[PDB]
UniProtKB/Swiss-Prot annotation, chain A:
InterPro entries: Ribosomal_uL22, Ribosomal_uL22_bac/chlpt-type, Ribosomal_uL22_bac/org-type, Ribosomal_uL22_CS, Ribosomal_uL22_sf. It comes from Mycoplasma pneumoniae (strain ATCC 29342 / M129 / Subtype 1) (Mycoplasmoides pneumoniae). Belongs to the universal ribosomal protein uL22 family. This is Large ribosomal subunit protein uL22. HAMAP family: Ribosomal_uL22_B. The keyword Nucleotide-binding does not apply. GO terms for cellular component: cytosolic large ribosomal subunit. PANTHER family: CHLOROPLAST 50S RIBOSOMAL PROTEIN L22-RELATED, LARGE RIBOSOMAL SUBUNIT PROTEIN UL22M.
UniProtKB/Swiss-Prot annotation, chain C:
Residues 8-19 have a biased composition (Basic residues). Binds to the 23S rRNA. The gene is rplO. The chain holds residues 3 to 51 of 151 of the full protein. Residues 20-34 have a biased composition (Gly residues). Residues 1-49 are annotated as: Disordered. Disulfide bonds: none annotated. Part of the 50S ribosomal subunit. This is Large ribosomal subunit protein uL15. It comes from Mycoplasma pneumoniae (strain ATCC 29342 / M129 / Subtype 1). Belongs to the universal ribosomal protein uL15 family. It comes from the Bacteria.
Swiss-Prot record, chain D:
The keyword Cell division does not apply. One of its GO terms (biological process) is translation. GO terms for molecular function: rRNA binding; structural constituent of ribosome. PROSITE patterns: RIBOSOMAL_L20. InterPro entries: Ribosomal_bL20, RIBOSOMAL_L20_CS, Ribosomal_protein_bL20_C. Keywords: Ribonucleoprotein, Ribosomal protein, RNA-binding, rRNA-binding. This is Large ribosomal subunit protein bL20. The gene is rplT. Belongs to the bacterial ribosomal protein bL20 family.
Swiss-Prot record, chain G:
This is Large ribosomal subunit protein uL13. It comes from Mycoplasma pneumoniae (strain ATCC 29342 / M129 / Subtype 1). One of its GO terms (cellular component) is cytosolic large ribosomal subunit. InterPro entries: Ribosomal_uL13 (IPR005822), Ribosomal_uL13_bac-type (IPR005823), Ribosomal_uL13_CS (IPR023563), Ribosomal_uL13_sf (IPR036899). The gene is rplM. The lineage of its organism: Bacteria, Bacillati, Mycoplasmatota, Mycoplasmoidales, Mycoplasmoidaceae. CDD domains: Ribosomal_L13. Keywords: Ribonucleoprotein, Ribosomal protein.
Length: 139, 158, 49, 114, 56, 99, 144
RNA sequence: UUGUGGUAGACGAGCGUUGUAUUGGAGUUGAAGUCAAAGCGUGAGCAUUGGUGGAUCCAAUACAAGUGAGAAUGCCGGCA
RNA sequence: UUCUCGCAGUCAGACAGUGGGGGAUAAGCUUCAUUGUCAAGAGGGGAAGAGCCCAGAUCAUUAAAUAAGGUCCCCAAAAUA
RNA sequence: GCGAAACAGUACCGUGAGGGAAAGGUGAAAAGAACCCAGAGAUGGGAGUGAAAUAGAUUCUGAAACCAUAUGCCUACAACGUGUCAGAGCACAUUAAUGUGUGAUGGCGUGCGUUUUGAAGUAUGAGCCGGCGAGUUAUGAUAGCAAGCGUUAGUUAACCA
């Protein structure tokens, strides 16, 4: 399907983000929106904004039902994080990594969004072998 | 070179208590600072010694092999006057002799201004002097054109 | 010949490269032994020695 | 004049890493481990190329001897039936494949009786 | 204490396998509107059938 | 059917019109080539070989096996020898092996 | 080249046999059982596929043993605890798990593999004589 | 006929790259780089096609190398 | 395997049988000589082993005859008296 | 490549002397995303622009390691440098080929360079990826190979054009 919801480099630890979005993956919008609205983790509100924007875009831009959509896939793309120096005992310095990541989710409203990739790959191999055989057709 | 360094020769690290390499310098060639021990330098010979006997023998051999060629026809004084400082006549002559793609070279000794003025509209046209042309330009000439009177003198030049 | 097929008359000799390659050896060892100044830089002590 | 050493070296690393295929975890992502695995695999391939012939011969002898024992003799006896009189060029594997068509290797057994 | 060697990625997956989280309780507001969590006061500021506080 | 045929230095059991593989014979594809070094055909037994019985095969193809990349390396020593072996073969089947 | 050795694939066979070892030497019965399970006696043997045949033994408490091995050979079992070893004599084992001793001896005579774990569980040795494993109709015989 | 175990060590003969010199070609109907493939070699290697990509590259002959990267707790950057 | 030129490399060798010495006929010990192995050469047997026993391997082959060594099973192969 | 491709002897360090870094790339021209939607907005999704927006200002190309994801394979009794040769089974149809992907299991099996009397070693060093990263040059001599010249030989240095 369509109506993915990207987000560029929000401050978040990817470790917790993966777990929370694997908890939220699979289910539909409302039955998951209510549960994420009560998530004790702090990341949920940031993801909540993204999912509300995603369903709004799906309804407005794409005209889909929105109710039958569900989280097909979660990925938390790690972006260039921050590195900061903190003094430490015995005269040392330590480089602590302030972690941020790119958050984006996929919405599906069908028994599909998996086969079409296979068809595209098969077509790619088909044109590859067509070119190979056209080269072999030289006389 | 290694004389391009900047700073002291002090050790950046400690003699002991170092769990790293030796690293006794600051701008090592294996380090980012550079300074490779080897590299091109503007002081080599770029030339060597050769003998005139072999040079003359080879030059005479090239003269023979080019006299054996077809498009090496004679040149004289009359067509020097018959040609002018205009590039038109040269191109007409080249077209009438299908010397367009040919690398034909011209031989000049009277130093006529008309000849040297021309031969600049194509990458294959140029003129050279008898004592100013060597074996390469003689054979890269690709069936050049040569004067008439000087050849007998050139016979003495081997 | 000409400058499209020029070849020598068997005027081409081997070059013992001491820095590169392993198929002919000629690498780390570089034919200098395994020990001593002869196996180290600025070797070849004075001929009168 | 200087030459950059990126393209050909990169292609060399590419082909060497592609030589290693069918490995677990951190074994197809580094030059050193891939090269070591390739060399060990080649040595194993040669050693197994011989040991497969040895093992096939051993299994052929085992099942041929089993067939002789159910027919009522040992492996050494059958050798005498051939070597000592009218030696045949029959293969142990082929005599073993004769099991796939039974009551025919038994014709050979009764033929070589002496 | 430092490891003998760096931990493998599959060992990391084993470490985080039991670290997996579960869901939490949910309950429809018997008097207020949208869903809430079990044994909680709704966004309408009340316990089930127990108006005690303003919604906002 | 059943027939033991000695190709090269190895024996193969074959039946009526079976496409199988041997060492390459260096022959054009499509011809008929006869072999007499044949034993154990048509339920007949001979000690070294058999007479009056021959096999007649047809050549279908000449190919190669995979790249046998034999690489020999000795630990802690300056020796690493690489090689890649491609060994020819012939795929062929028997047509009218006489008995 | 190759002769393309034909071998059975995805095939299963497990027959049932039974004997009585009253006064019989352990070693011969053990090696015969090893042959039966490993499938050496078979002529279509395939290692990575089904090999064994279901095996049952009745009245394994009357085994014979030459010499004084009842008081010469001793069997030991040391636990992971310190000094956690117990030692038993041959005559004592005659009233103890000698059937399990036969089990251990024959599994020791089998090649070491995870199939041997599945090979040996097919052996049902009983000190007594009555059991419901006879419902599979074992073939009564001798020299199994 | 001898043959092809192989250290240091030595002889023999090649491959690839950058640029130059001649000579030739190809190129938005598509150049390099790039990844992918279940190709071809006694080897350094050689290609074809797909798509990212959008501007020069390649064939053969020689010429000179800052000409060939697994180690040096090699150097830097990034990632664990 | 005489001789000329060129590159060498090398005086950290070890071990086994045999003649020894020292040591204590003790040494996985040391120092001399002979033969052999490894270094500088993989494998088979001795259960595992650098030096023990066979020998010197281009590669491929689902062949055999054998060598040292073995035929109750694990692990291919025998029994007769 | 001047340390400096720029606001480079800059930032920064050290009181001071002194030491001393890195980093370039939009599009033909900003024609630089009007406007709408989610939100507080950055932003994200549409529309439009432009040939083209995987050309949207993190704006030439975007490799490897690293991380997330899913097609299929198999696995929770398994003693293993994680591999090799066979091998069922599972899923497909391929740089057209006795095809691949994967491998329940069987057969076997203790890494790389250095140093050496020997290193699978409880000797040494390597977290990893990418890039950089060490036999050149001048002068002189000796020897080999090839060529030219020569029978009163060969050869020009500096220098002149």
């Amino acid at each position: 399907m369509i109506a993915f919801a990207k987000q560029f480099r929000v401050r978040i630890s990817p470790q917790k983000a993966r777990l929370v979005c694997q908890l939220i993956v699979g289910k539909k919008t409302a039955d998951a929106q209510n549960i994420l609205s009560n998530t004790p983790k702090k990341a949920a509100t940031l993801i909540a904004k993204l999912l509300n924007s995603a369903i709004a875009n799906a309804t407005n831009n794409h005209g889909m039902n929105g109710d039958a959509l569900y989280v097909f896939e979660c990925v938390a793309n790690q972006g260039p994080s921050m590195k900061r120096t903190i003094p430490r005992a015995k005269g040392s310095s330590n480089m602590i990594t302030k972690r941020s990541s790119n958050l984006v989710v996929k919405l599906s409203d069908n028994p599909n969004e998996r086969q079409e990739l296979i068809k595209q790959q098969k077509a790619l191999v088909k044109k590859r072998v067509e070119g190979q055989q056209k080269a072999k057709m030289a006389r | 070179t290694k004389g391009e360094v900047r700073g002291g020769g002090k050790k950046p690290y400690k003699q002991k208590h170092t769990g790293k390499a030796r690293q006794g310098s600051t701008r090592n060639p294996h380090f980012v600072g550079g300074g490779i021990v080897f590299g091109p330098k503007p002081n080599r010979n770029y030339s060597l010694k050769l003998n005139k006997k072999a040079h003359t023998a080879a030059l005479h051999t090239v003269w023979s092999e080019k006299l054996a060629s077809d498009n090496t026809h004679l040149v004289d004084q009359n067509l020097f006057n018959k040609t002018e400082g205009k590039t038109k006549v040269m191109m007409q002559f080249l077209k009438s002799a299908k010397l367009l793609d040919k690398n034909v070279l011209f031989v000049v000794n009277t130093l006529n201004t008309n000849l040297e003025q021309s031969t600049s509209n194509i990458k294959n046209v140029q003129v050279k002097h008898l004592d100013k042309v060597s074996v390469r330009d003689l054979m890269l000439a690709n069936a050049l054109l040569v004067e008439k009177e000087v050849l007998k003198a050139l016979e003495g030049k081997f | 010949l000409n400058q499209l097929k020029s070849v020598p008359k068997a005027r081409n000799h081997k070059t013992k490269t001491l820095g590169r390659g392993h198929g002919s050896g000629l690498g780390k060892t570089s034919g200098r032994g395994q020990k001593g100044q002869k196996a180290r830089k600025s070797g070849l002590t004075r001929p009168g020695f | 004049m200087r030459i950059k050493g990126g393209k050909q070296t990169r292609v060399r690393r590419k082909k060497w890493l592609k030589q290693a295929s069918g490995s677990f975890g951190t074994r197809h992502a580094s030059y050193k481990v891939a090269k070591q695995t390739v060399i060990q695999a080649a040595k194993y391939a040669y050693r197994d190329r011989r040991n497969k012939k040895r093992d096939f011969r051993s299994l052929w002898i085992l099942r041929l001897n089993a067939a002789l024992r159910e027919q009522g003799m040992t492996y050494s006896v059958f050798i005498n039936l051939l070597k000592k009189h009218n030696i045949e060029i029959n293969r142990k594997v082929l005599s073993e494949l004769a099991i796939k068509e039974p009551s025919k290797f038994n014709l050979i057994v009764q033929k070589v009786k002496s | 204490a430092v490891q003998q060697r760096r931990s493998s990625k599959h060992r990391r997956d084993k470490r985080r396998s039991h670290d997996a989280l579960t869901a939490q309780a949910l309950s429809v507001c018997q008097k207020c509107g949208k869903k809430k969590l079990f044994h909680r006061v709704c966004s309408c500021g009340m316990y089930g059938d127990l108006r005690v506080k303003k919604a906002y | 059917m059943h027939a033991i045929v000695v190709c090269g230095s190895k024996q193969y059991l074959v039946h009526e019109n079976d496409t199988f593989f041997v060492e390459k014979l260096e022959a054009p594809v499509g011809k008929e080539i006869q072999l007499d070094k044949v034993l154990m055909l048509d339920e007949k037994i001979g000690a070294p070989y058999l007479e009056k019985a021959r096999v007649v095969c047809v050549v279908e193809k000449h190919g190669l096996q995979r790249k046998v990349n034999v690489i020999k390396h000795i630990s802690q020593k300056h020796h690493l020898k690489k090689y890649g072996h491609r060994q020819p073969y012939t795929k062929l089947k028997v047509v009218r092996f006489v008995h | 080249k190759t002769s393309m050795l034909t071998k059975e694939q995805a095939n299963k066979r497990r027959q049932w046999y039974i004997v009585d070892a009253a006064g019989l030497v352990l070693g011969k019965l053990a090696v015969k059982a090893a042959d039966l399970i490993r499938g050496k006696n078979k002529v279509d043997f395939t290692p990575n596929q089904d090999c064994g045949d279901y095996l049952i033994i009745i009245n394994s408490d009357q085994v014979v043993l030459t010499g004084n091995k009842k008081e010469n050979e001793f069997w030991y079992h040391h636990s992971q605890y310190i000094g956690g070893i117990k030692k038993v004599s041959g005559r004592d084992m005659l009233k103890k798990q000698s059937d399990k001793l036969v089990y251990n001896a024959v599994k020791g005579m089998l090649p070491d593999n995870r199939l041997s774990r599945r090979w040996i569980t097919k052996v049902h040795v009983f000190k007594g004589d009555k059991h419901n494993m006879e419902a599979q109709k074992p073939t009564t015989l001798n020299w199994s």
